[PDB]
Amino acid sequence: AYDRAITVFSPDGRLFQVEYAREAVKKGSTALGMKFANGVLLISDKKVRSRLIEQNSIEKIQLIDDYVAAVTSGLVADARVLVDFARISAQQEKVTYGSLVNIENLVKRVADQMQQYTQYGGVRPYGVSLIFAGIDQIGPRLFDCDPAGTINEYKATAIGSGKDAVVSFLEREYKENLPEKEAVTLGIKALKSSLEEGEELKAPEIASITVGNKYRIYDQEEVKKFL
Amino acid sequence: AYDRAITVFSPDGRLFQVEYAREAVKKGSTALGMKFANGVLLISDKKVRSRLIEQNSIEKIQLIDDYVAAVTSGLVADARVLVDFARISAQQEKVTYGSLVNIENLVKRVADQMQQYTQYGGVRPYGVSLIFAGIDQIGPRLFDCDPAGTINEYKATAIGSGKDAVVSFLEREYKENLPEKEAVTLGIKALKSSLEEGEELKAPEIASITVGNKYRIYDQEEVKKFL
Amino acid sequence: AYDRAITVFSPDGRLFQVEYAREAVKKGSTALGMKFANGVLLISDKKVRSRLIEQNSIEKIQLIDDYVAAVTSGLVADARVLVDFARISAQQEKVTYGSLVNIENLVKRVADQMQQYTQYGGVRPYGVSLIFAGIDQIGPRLFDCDPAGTINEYKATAIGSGKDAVVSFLEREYKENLPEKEAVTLGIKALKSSLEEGEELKAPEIASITVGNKYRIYDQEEVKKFL
Amino acid sequence: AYDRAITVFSPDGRLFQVEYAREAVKKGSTALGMKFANGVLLISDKKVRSRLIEQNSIEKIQLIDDYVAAVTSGLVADARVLVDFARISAQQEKVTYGSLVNIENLVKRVADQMQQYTQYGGVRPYGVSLIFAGIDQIGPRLFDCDPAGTINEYKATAIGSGKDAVVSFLEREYKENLPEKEAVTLGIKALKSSLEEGEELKAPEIASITVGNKYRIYDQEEVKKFL
Amino acid sequence: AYDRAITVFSPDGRLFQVEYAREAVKKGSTALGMKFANGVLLISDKKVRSRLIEQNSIEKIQLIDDYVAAVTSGLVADARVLVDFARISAQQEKVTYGSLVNIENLVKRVADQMQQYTQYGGVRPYGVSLIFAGIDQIGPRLFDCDPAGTINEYKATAIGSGKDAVVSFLEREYKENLPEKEAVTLGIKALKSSLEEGEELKAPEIASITVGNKYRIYDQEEVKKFL
Amino acid sequence: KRAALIQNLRDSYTETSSFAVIEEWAAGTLQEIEGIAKAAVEAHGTIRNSTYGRAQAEKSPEQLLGVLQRYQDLCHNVYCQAETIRTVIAIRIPEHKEADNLGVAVQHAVLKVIDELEIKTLGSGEKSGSGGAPTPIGMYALREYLSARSTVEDKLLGGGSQSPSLLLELRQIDADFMLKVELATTHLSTMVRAVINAYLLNWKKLIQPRGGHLDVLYR
Amino acid sequence: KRAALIQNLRDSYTETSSFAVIEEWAAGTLQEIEGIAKAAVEAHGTIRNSTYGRAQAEKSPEQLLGVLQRYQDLCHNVYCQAETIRTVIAIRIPEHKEADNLGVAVQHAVLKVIDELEIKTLGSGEKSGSGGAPTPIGMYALREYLSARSTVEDKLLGGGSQSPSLLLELRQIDADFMLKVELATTHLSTMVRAVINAYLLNWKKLIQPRGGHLDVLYR
Amino acid sequence: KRAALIQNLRDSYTETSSFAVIEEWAAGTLQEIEGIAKAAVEAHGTIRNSTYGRAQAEKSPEQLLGVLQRYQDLCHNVYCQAETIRTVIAIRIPEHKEADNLGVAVQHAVLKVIDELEIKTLGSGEKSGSGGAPTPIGMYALREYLSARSTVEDKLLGGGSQSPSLLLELRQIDADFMLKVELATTHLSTMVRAVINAYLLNWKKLIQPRGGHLDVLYR
Amino acid sequence: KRAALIQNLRDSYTETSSFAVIEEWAAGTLQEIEGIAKAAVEAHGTIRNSTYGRAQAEKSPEQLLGVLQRYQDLCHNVYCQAETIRTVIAIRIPEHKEADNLGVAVQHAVLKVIDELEIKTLGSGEKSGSGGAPTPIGMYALREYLSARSTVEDKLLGGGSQSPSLLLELRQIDADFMLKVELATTHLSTMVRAVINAYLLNWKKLIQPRGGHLDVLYR
């Protein structure tokens, strides 16, 4: 009887409505990423859909800068509004400081925005989690921003329906500073071990940066190598 | 007990009110479109009504520019308010950039407008889906904007009550770059295979553009050819 | 349990509160109109009431200009507020463009106003439908604006409790470009065939325009001819 | 279950809350008025109360100008707030046009004010009906403004608990252009035939205007004549 | 089920919430007043309380001017906020017109303020009635302002728990233009006949004005005379 | 035509028929209840000032039979007269709507009260199945009397029984059933006067369940 | 095909069948109820002006048997005719939805009223288990009569019994069951006229539980 | 005229009649309950200090019969006096409205309490059907006594039976029914004093269910 | 694997099995109900045009036995065919959630209607415990017939009894149980056609209680 409003705690002291937005994230497809020797990558599972769909607009990975990028999971409407807010906040940070100096308060803008809606009635939260990744003045960054707004810097994570299984794999297999290729194949194995039996891993979008370089997205045949 | 407010998630994390606006779309008549060799078209089913009605104002297809057009399905009140917002947004994009440079953020404006109402209490969503289509600096475009706001670039789609059957047909029959006539007849067969048994396809409105040309709507006797 | 708020859809995706405003229209008396050879008319049934009432203020037909006029059906309070808004919007259109150039966006002003209240909580819709008719730069116009806001250009319509029976008659009897008198008598027969058995058609108010002329309302003895 | 909010229609399409304000009017004492040969009058029943009450402040009839006056029935608090708004709107009309040119949009100000509260939640309507009467540039006027805001020009009416019986009498007895005295005695007979058996008509306040003259209220002994 | 909101009428047309504020007035102690030969007085019952209380701040009678005064009954918090608003409105009337010209629209300020809260949701009414009394340009005044806002000029009244019994006494005993002393003793007898059996009338605060003079409050030993 | 059949029902059972029933209850029924109550008072003491034997198990007390028969005929008349008001109200229950049921609820309330009247006017033995109020005897007063008495008369006449508590049980059948008659008449007085109150305050909403002047609002 | 089977049901039991039942109730059923009521009135007084003996326990009262049989055949006909209207309404109950049930609630209300009709038309003995209204006799009128009479006839014929209250109990069986017949006919008159009112005011929502012109709103 | 009939009811059964009943309960009824309770106390010990045989199955205990008859007459008087207050409240239940039922709910509450009084004053055997409170004996005290005693007296007298538990069961009938009388008088004391409290605190809303000074607000 | 067992249930009892049951009901079951109804009509009049004696208590009416046995076999077949649809719906009741139960409520409603069908198809004697609708006979028609007839045949054959009401009670057993058969067939016609309507309008939500295209919304 308490899980109807965003502004009511429970006898344990729980915000169920926030947790149900977190459950809405869990219905999205798995997307992971990690940092390595001079840079970070991102991997995102895509169960291949209608060939009528222009492939340009089903990419869960999105460029928020030449030097910051992210991936979502959850509601697609809220997901797109969020990556829009990430882009606009990157531009505001870049115009007030001359450059996106550190990725952290880009994600703070996004995080405070997502947090505020977990507090006021008449508003629902965003049912999306986001994984940011890029290069700044400090180096490789990797965050995750959840529906409640909580951000944490990682060396590897996932989001989506697999998230527990992927972080379980990476929790016992990931070793830092892998050269890019070896890192990618480790992350592919991580993504593989989150599916159910009988499911064949289709082609997932994967993209990376190294320190001093810009973004690139591996096209489908460079992806096709690690199948 | 959770499908009463726009701002409440469920034990799965579902927004039923948004889904019921999507169900309100499903009660509208089928309308499809696809791109082809230098251009895009749109087809819209119309079960012919009262001859007292001036035919000028039952057109589901509407010109938002000489170079962008769309078609709706759902609530007719919200439908007209939406095509009005699409027109005004096209004019604002055209005045700030000199021309409608890309169709994409015309549809982003419409999308963000439709998304915002799926988040705040005291407001209901729009029960309309829209299919945009035109030529820009890039070329043939084709989107669909749903009640939640979600936009996706396609090479072919439908909306309305037939949508699943039409996208099921096009999913196994559509081949890109057809010369305009062959494309139209494929889309007519798509629209045919979505009706129920005994129903005869009446005359549907169909319109197209090619790259470098303006709009034209096939009049009823050019339509009458492909019956 | 969903027909209590204006902002809640249903398992089918219906807005019942809007439909109940449409039901509130249905309790008003029948009023019809059609266009003909150079002009449009309007007919409105009136079950004759208290002779204490000054007849100047029971006219369902109202002049929104010398060149636009309309008729209502539904709640009398909302009806008068609406014909006021139609008049004020005609004056704003006339002052920004020098003249009421086209009737269509006078009715767009009225339509957007009536639509907006079908979307926000804390406001109820208008329980009135309006039939606009006049001469513009284009020629004879004839619209109907319903509680949800939906406008449609017709060649003949009705509103009110008879509406289905009158549009059923006109749907099989109306022929365009009748000279004014013959048109009026057709519309009188239309209005006659909507009453119940035993009811005698009293004297209804009827008014018309021709292209290049102003308004006139047939007085009761010119009306008395067609009984 | 629908008669709790001002903003919810019913399966028939009824605004019960507005009708309940109309029922609140029905508990007030009867007050009538009519126009005659060059002018209008008003009659108001008063069951004589506490002799400690200064008689200057139980007058249901109130002067909104030297040339407009009215009478109320319903809630006494809302009644006085309404006659205040009538006075203030008379002064605003008089300052923007030099004089109270027509009584009609004084009553439009009052009517739009009373109508607005029948539409927005968090506000209740006024439970008062008002009968305006005076002389303008046109001549004798006589309106009634109900809780929903609906105004109508009459030649005779009542409001209050008797209203049906008085308008029933006047509906079969009233003849226009009576010289003032004969009119008053007809209205007294009208007021008499609305009471219940055994009740004796006490002394009612009555006041009138003729064209070109100001207001006057018949004092209790000029009233005492027509008992 | 309708006595929960300030904005909902009933099948009779009753505002129960306003009536319950009027019931909250009824739990306050009796206070009366009347006008006489050149002036007005006020009498207020006080069941004598804690001798720790400074007697300066249990006075139900309060000076709103040297030439207007009042007495309350009901909620003590709302009572003090109301006598504050009466004082501030007296000062605003005095600064815009040079002097408190007539007591009536001081009480109109207070009355409109108290009425407004009987209409909007999210606000409760004031549970206090006030009796104003003083000398103006006209002469002796005596009003009562109830929770709904309704003001009436009297020659004698009470408020509080006795109100019916005191107005019942004065309704058959009060004669106007008594010299001050005789008036006071009549009002004391009025206050006496409202108590219950066994209760002895303690010392009540009583104060008066005559025309051209200022205020004075009879001290306890001038009061002690009329016991 | 349907409106003809509805008007044929309502003109047949109308408000003057129901109010004639209410007038008959307000005068004659109440004094007849009181007369049967006083007869039960007198017969109870006539039983009380007596000591029985075998001879009182050989003849039925015709005075008690007459008191029971008078109460039974009263209950029959009150039931049929209540059914008259039931039909008058029930043929004016309007079209079923989810709102506008203000006067419809008045009709359901008054029909509920008349239900209570006739459920405590209709007869019942000791059912031993209900947790509510046990119904005072009703229609089967003389039936239940003669059954419960004939059992003890069979046990007393046969050789016969030697239980003196059986003989005093026969005596208690006589006194107890007259006592039940006077209890029942007191409660029927209460219930009849309650129904008279309910009709005479609610008859306007009973006949017109909703008032329609929609042409003032809807034109 | 499914729509063919639905149309096959609805064309078979239609609105003219239900309204023909309502016409038959509005004329013939009501005068037949009244005729059986007057026959019960006359037979009750025929029993009342009599004093019984052993000879009245030796032959069954064929007049009372005929009155009970007429009431029984009436209840059978009224039950079957009510089941006709039940089927007409129940084959037009639409697809189950959580909203749009305005006319569906009208159907449930009218079916609830017809339930009351046939639950007080179907028969029952004195169940002694219900706290509601005890049902007037119903279908088993002649059955309950002959059972309750045959018990007393066994006790009177056998040597026989000597209880005079048993003989007057047989007399009270005769008078009381005719009294129950006339009570039951009065209540059935009330209930039948209530159902006639309910159908003739609600038939539009009974046949069309929801009206659809969604193409005006949804295009 | 209708108002004449309503005034004829209310002037006939008024507040002074109901308060005279409350005065009689507050003094005399309570000491009569206490006297019957003390008589039950003494008779219970008179049974307790005894050992029975065949001779105690041959004569009914007239002292116990008198105690049961006194309690029975008390319950009759308390029932009729409660029905007086029931009628006084029930003839002042106003017009049925969906609001303004503040004092109407007071009337329904006090009638509910008087319902409890008379449902535990009216009599009942061991019904074995209810899950609520089993009713202390009520009106049928002497009836249930003589029935349950006459069964055991038939079994003891006939040759007779040889069960000593049957003889001690007769003894336990005697002691247990006096025990039930004193339990019942204690509970009736509690219930009567509760009803006296309810009336003396609620009589203003019982007689005036709503106060109307609408001319102050509606003019 | 669990999904294998769920698919093993659903492929075993599928929608074509349930709709084959609905087709069999829509044609053959209804004409068999009507044939047993006409046989009950004819047998009732065959009993009616007769006067009985001791000889009719010496042989059982094999024609009535055959009519009861046909109705019993019909009720068995209708029960098993209803249980088929019950299993088809009940093996597609989805995972229990606090929302998304729109089509789940359709399943509960249709199962509730089939519950009504089989609760008035399963048999019951006169239970005298329920306040709802007494169930028309059901499965135990020939059982209840032979029991209630054999009691009267024992009383008539033994010397035998001399009650003529007992003989006419045997006659009324014969006529009344055929009457109950034809009442029961009319009500079963109504109920079967209601269930056919419910399935043929609700089968889409019965088989798919919720539709999932969440990948459009959740990606």
Side-chain angles (χ1 to χ4, degrees), chain H residues 183-210:
Chain H
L183 296 172
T185 55
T186 304
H187 188 274
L188 260 292
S189 293
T190 300
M191 188 65 73
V192 165
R193 294 184 186 187
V195 176
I196 290 170
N197 189 22
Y199 184 80
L200 291 175
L201 288 176
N202 291 315
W203 63 276
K204 292 186 287 184
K205 297 292 183 183
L206 289 174
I207 302 299
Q208 297 293 322
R210 69 266 188 101

Short mmCIF file of all heavy atoms in Angstrom, two decimals, chain H residues 183-210:
data_model
loop_
_atom_site.label_atom_id
_atom_site.label_comp_id
_atom_site.label_asym_id
_atom_site.label_seq_id
_atom_site.Cartn_x
_atom_site.Cartn_y
_atom_site.Cartn_z
N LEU H 183 -27.13 -16.10 35.53
CA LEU H 183 -26.28 -15.57 34.46
C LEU H 183 -27.03 -14.56 33.60
O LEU H 183 -26.51 -13.47 33.30
CB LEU H 183 -25.79 -16.69 33.54
CG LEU H 183 -24.88 -17.86 33.93
CD1 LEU H 183 -24.81 -18.85 32.78
CD2 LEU H 183 -23.51 -17.43 34.36
N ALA H 184 -28.26 -14.91 33.21
CA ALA H 184 -29.09 -14.08 32.36
C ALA H 184 -29.48 -12.78 33.04
O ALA H 184 -29.52 -11.73 32.40
CB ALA H 184 -30.33 -14.86 31.96
N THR H 185 -29.73 -12.81 34.36
CA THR H 185 -30.08 -11.58 35.07
C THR H 185 -28.87 -10.67 35.20
O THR H 185 -29.01 -9.44 35.10
CB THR H 185 -30.67 -11.89 36.45
OG1 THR H 185 -29.76 -12.71 37.19
CG2 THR H 185 -32.02 -12.56 36.33
N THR H 186 -27.67 -11.24 35.39
CA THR H 186 -26.46 -10.41 35.43
C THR H 186 -26.22 -9.72 34.08
O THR H 186 -25.95 -8.50 34.03
CB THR H 186 -25.26 -11.26 35.83
OG1 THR H 186 -25.53 -11.90 37.09
CG2 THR H 186 -24.04 -10.41 35.98
N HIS H 187 -26.38 -10.46 32.98
CA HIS H 187 -26.16 -9.87 31.67
C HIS H 187 -27.26 -8.87 31.31
O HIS H 187 -26.99 -7.86 30.64
CB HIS H 187 -26.08 -10.95 30.59
CG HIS H 187 -25.66 -10.41 29.26
ND1 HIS H 187 -26.55 -9.88 28.36
CD2 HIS H 187 -24.44 -10.30 28.69
CE1 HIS H 187 -25.90 -9.48 27.28
NE2 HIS H 187 -24.61 -9.73 27.46
N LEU H 188 -28.49 -9.11 31.76
CA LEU H 188 -29.56 -8.16 31.51
C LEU H 188 -29.37 -6.87 32.31
O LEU H 188 -29.71 -5.79 31.83
CB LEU H 188 -30.93 -8.78 31.81
CG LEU H 188 -31.73 -9.30 30.61
CD1 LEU H 188 -32.18 -8.12 29.79
CD2 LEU H 188 -30.95 -10.27 29.75
N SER H 189 -28.80 -6.97 33.52
CA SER H 189 -28.41 -5.78 34.27
C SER H 189 -27.41 -4.93 33.50
O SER H 189 -27.58 -3.71 33.35
CB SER H 189 -27.82 -6.17 35.62
OG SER H 189 -28.78 -6.75 36.46
N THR H 190 -26.36 -5.59 32.98
CA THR H 190 -25.35 -4.92 32.16
C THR H 190 -25.96 -4.24 30.94
O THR H 190 -25.68 -3.06 30.66
CB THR H 190 -24.30 -5.94 31.73
OG1 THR H 190 -23.68 -6.52 32.88
CG2 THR H 190 -23.24 -5.29 30.85
N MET H 191 -26.84 -4.95 30.24
CA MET H 191 -27.38 -4.44 28.98
C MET H 191 -28.37 -3.31 29.21
O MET H 191 -28.38 -2.32 28.46
CB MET H 191 -28.03 -5.59 28.21
CG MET H 191 -28.43 -5.22 26.82
SD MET H 191 -27.04 -4.80 25.76
CE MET H 191 -26.34 -6.43 25.48
N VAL H 192 -29.21 -3.43 30.24
CA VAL H 192 -30.17 -2.38 30.59
C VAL H 192 -29.45 -1.11 31.00
O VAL H 192 -29.82 -0.01 30.57
CB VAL H 192 -31.14 -2.88 31.68
CG1 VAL H 192 -31.90 -1.73 32.32
CG2 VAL H 192 -32.16 -3.81 31.07
N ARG H 193 -28.36 -1.24 31.77
CA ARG H 193 -27.64 -0.04 32.18
C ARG H 193 -26.89 0.59 31.00
O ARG H 193 -26.78 1.83 30.93
CB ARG H 193 -26.71 -0.36 33.35
CG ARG H 193 -27.52 -0.71 34.57
CD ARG H 193 -26.72 -0.97 35.84
NE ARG H 193 -27.64 -1.44 36.87
CZ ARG H 193 -27.34 -1.64 38.14
NH1 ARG H 193 -26.14 -1.38 38.58
NH2 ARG H 193 -28.28 -2.08 38.98
N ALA H 194 -26.46 -0.23 30.04
CA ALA H 194 -25.87 0.31 28.81
C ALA H 194 -26.89 1.10 28.00
O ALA H 194 -26.58 2.17 27.46
CB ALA H 194 -25.28 -0.82 27.98
N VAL H 195 -28.13 0.60 27.91
CA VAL H 195 -29.16 1.28 27.12
C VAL H 195 -29.60 2.57 27.82
O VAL H 195 -29.89 3.58 27.16
CB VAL H 195 -30.35 0.33 26.86
CG1 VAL H 195 -31.48 1.03 26.13
CG2 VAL H 195 -29.89 -0.81 26.02
N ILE H 196 -29.63 2.55 29.16
CA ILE H 196 -29.94 3.76 29.93
C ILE H 196 -28.89 4.83 29.68
O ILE H 196 -29.23 6.01 29.45
CB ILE H 196 -30.08 3.42 31.43
CG1 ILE H 196 -31.33 2.60 31.69
CG2 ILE H 196 -30.14 4.66 32.27
CD1 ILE H 196 -31.39 2.04 33.08
N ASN H 197 -27.62 4.44 29.67
CA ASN H 197 -26.53 5.36 29.33
C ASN H 197 -26.70 5.93 27.93
O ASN H 197 -26.55 7.15 27.72
CB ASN H 197 -25.19 4.64 29.41
CG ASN H 197 -24.03 5.59 29.28
OD1 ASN H 197 -24.17 6.78 29.55
ND2 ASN H 197 -22.93 5.10 28.75
N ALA H 198 -27.01 5.06 26.96
CA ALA H 198 -27.10 5.48 25.56
C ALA H 198 -28.23 6.47 25.34
O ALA H 198 -28.04 7.49 24.66
CB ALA H 198 -27.28 4.25 24.67
N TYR H 199 -29.39 6.21 25.94
CA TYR H 199 -30.52 7.14 25.81
C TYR H 199 -30.22 8.47 26.50
O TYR H 199 -30.43 9.54 25.92
CB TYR H 199 -31.80 6.54 26.38
CG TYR H 199 -33.01 7.44 26.18
CD1 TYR H 199 -33.68 7.47 24.97
CD2 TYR H 199 -33.47 8.28 27.20
CE1 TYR H 199 -34.77 8.29 24.77
CE2 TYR H 199 -34.55 9.11 27.01
CZ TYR H 199 -35.20 9.11 25.80
OH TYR H 199 -36.29 9.93 25.60
N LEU H 200 -29.72 8.41 27.74
CA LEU H 200 -29.53 9.64 28.49
C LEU H 200 -28.38 10.49 27.96
O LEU H 200 -28.31 11.68 28.30
CB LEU H 200 -29.30 9.33 29.96
CG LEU H 200 -30.52 8.78 30.67
CD1 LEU H 200 -30.15 8.38 32.06
CD2 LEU H 200 -31.61 9.81 30.69
N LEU H 201 -27.49 9.93 27.15
CA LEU H 201 -26.52 10.77 26.48
C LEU H 201 -26.94 11.18 25.07
O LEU H 201 -26.42 12.18 24.57
CB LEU H 201 -25.16 10.09 26.41
CG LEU H 201 -24.43 10.01 27.74
CD1 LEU H 201 -23.16 9.24 27.58
CD2 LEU H 201 -24.13 11.41 28.25
N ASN H 202 -27.85 10.45 24.43
CA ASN H 202 -28.13 10.70 23.02
C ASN H 202 -29.52 11.23 22.71
O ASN H 202 -29.83 11.42 21.53
CB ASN H 202 -27.91 9.41 22.22
CG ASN H 202 -26.47 9.02 22.17
OD1 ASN H 202 -25.60 9.85 21.92
ND2 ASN H 202 -26.19 7.75 22.41
N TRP H 203 -30.37 11.49 23.72
CA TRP H 203 -31.78 11.82 23.52
C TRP H 203 -32.04 13.06 22.67
O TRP H 203 -33.04 13.12 21.95
CB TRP H 203 -32.45 11.98 24.89
CG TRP H 203 -31.89 13.10 25.69
CD1 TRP H 203 -30.79 13.07 26.49
CD2 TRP H 203 -32.43 14.42 25.81
NE1 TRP H 203 -30.59 14.29 27.07
CE2 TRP H 203 -31.58 15.14 26.68
CE3 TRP H 203 -33.54 15.07 25.26
CZ2 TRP H 203 -31.81 16.47 27.01
CZ3 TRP H 203 -33.76 16.39 25.58
CH2 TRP H 203 -32.90 17.08 26.45
N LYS H 204 -31.12 14.03 22.70
CA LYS H 204 -31.28 15.24 21.89
C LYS H 204 -31.19 14.93 20.40
O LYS H 204 -32.02 15.39 19.61
CB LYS H 204 -30.23 16.27 22.28
CG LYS H 204 -30.40 16.85 23.67
CD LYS H 204 -29.40 17.97 23.91
CE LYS H 204 -28.00 17.42 24.09
NZ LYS H 204 -27.00 18.47 24.42
N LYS H 205 -30.21 14.11 20.00
CA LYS H 205 -30.12 13.71 18.60
C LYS H 205 -31.12 12.61 18.26
O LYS H 205 -31.41 12.38 17.09
CB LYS H 205 -28.70 13.25 18.28
CG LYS H 205 -27.65 14.32 18.43
CD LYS H 205 -27.81 15.40 17.39
CE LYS H 205 -26.71 16.44 17.51
NZ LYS H 205 -26.88 17.56 16.54
N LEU H 206 -31.63 11.90 19.28
CA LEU H 206 -32.67 10.92 19.02
C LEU H 206 -34.00 11.58 18.67
O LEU H 206 -34.75 11.07 17.83
CB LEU H 206 -32.85 10.00 20.23
CG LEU H 206 -31.75 9.00 20.53
CD1 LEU H 206 -32.02 8.29 21.83
CD2 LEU H 206 -31.65 8.02 19.40
N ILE H 207 -34.30 12.71 19.30
CA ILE H 207 -35.56 13.38 19.03
C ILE H 207 -35.43 14.39 17.89
O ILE H 207 -36.31 14.47 17.03
CB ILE H 207 -36.08 14.04 20.32
CG1 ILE H 207 -36.25 12.96 21.38
CG2 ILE H 207 -37.39 14.75 20.10
CD1 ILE H 207 -37.24 11.89 21.02
N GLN H 208 -34.35 15.16 17.87
CA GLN H 208 -34.07 16.04 16.75
C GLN H 208 -32.88 15.48 15.98
O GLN H 208 -31.73 15.75 16.34
CB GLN H 208 -33.77 17.46 17.23
CG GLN H 208 -34.91 18.14 17.94
CD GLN H 208 -36.07 18.43 17.01
OE1 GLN H 208 -35.87 18.78 15.85
NE2 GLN H 208 -37.28 18.28 17.52
N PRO H 209 -33.11 14.68 14.94
CA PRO H 209 -31.98 14.11 14.19
C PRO H 209 -31.20 15.14 13.40
O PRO H 209 -30.03 14.91 13.09
CB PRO H 209 -32.66 13.08 13.28
CG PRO H 209 -34.02 13.59 13.10
CD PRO H 209 -34.40 14.24 14.39
N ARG H 210 -31.81 16.27 13.06
CA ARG H 210 -31.07 17.36 12.45
C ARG H 210 -31.67 18.71 12.81
O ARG H 210 -32.90 18.86 12.89
CB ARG H 210 -30.96 17.18 10.93
CG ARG H 210 -32.24 17.34 10.13
CD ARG H 210 -32.92 16.01 9.88
NE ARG H 210 -34.04 16.15 8.96
CZ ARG H 210 -33.98 15.84 7.67
NH1 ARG H 210 -32.87 15.35 7.15
NH2 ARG H 210 -35.05 16.01 6.90
#
